[PDB]
DNA sequence: GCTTTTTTTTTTCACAATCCCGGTGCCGAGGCCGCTCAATTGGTCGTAGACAGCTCTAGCACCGCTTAAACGCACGTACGGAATC
């Protein structure tokens, strides 16, 4: 019964809930929507993608493709 | 989840065009022939260039500063392209 508040997994929650039900969120795409004057200028989205397979790991995301050259991971419901 | 609607299918039917065949007939690809001129045979005669030996060109290697240009990094404007009509 841990509540973990962390700071860069809050910041993909927004990222992740800004679209709805239809599996089109990507870690390429998600870092071009997200990176407005907060995060660190370079290699801050190694973290975005750390934080993501974390995130999966809760239980709260899901994937259908992943990598490369496209993907889609999106918040699985309570 | 439930009707109550659009949206996208699939299906079914009639029709146009293309496709494949054998039948037919015409002519040019193919080969033969008989001749001829260009390739071959064997010859002389000259030098182009292969090769050895020497010169010394300029390409390579290395080095030690002095910036100028490349890097990366942040930021956001105007650009590309999706949507509409
Ligand atoms: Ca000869």
């Given at each position: 019964?841990?509540?973990?508040?962390?700071?860069?997994?809050?910041?993909?929650?927004?990222?992740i809930q800004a679209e709805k039900?239809?599996?089109?969120?990507?870690?390429?795409?998600?870092?071009?929507?997200?990176?407005?004057?907060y995060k660190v200028g370079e290699?801050?989205?190694?973290?975005?993608?750390?934080?993501?397979?974390?995130?999966?790991?809760?239980?709260?995301?899901?994937?259908?493709?992943?990598?490369?050259?496209?993907?889609?991971?999106?918040?699985?419901?309570?």
């Open positions: 019964k841990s509540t973990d508040h962390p700071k860069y997994s809050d910041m993909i929650v927004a990222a039900n239809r599996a089109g969120s990507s870690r390429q795409s998600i870092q071009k929507y997200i990176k407005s004057h290699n801050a989205d190694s973290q975005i993608k750390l934080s993501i397979k974390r995130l999966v790991t809760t239980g709260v995301l899901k994937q259908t493709k992943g990598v490369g050259a496209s993907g889609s991971f999106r918040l699985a419901k309570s």
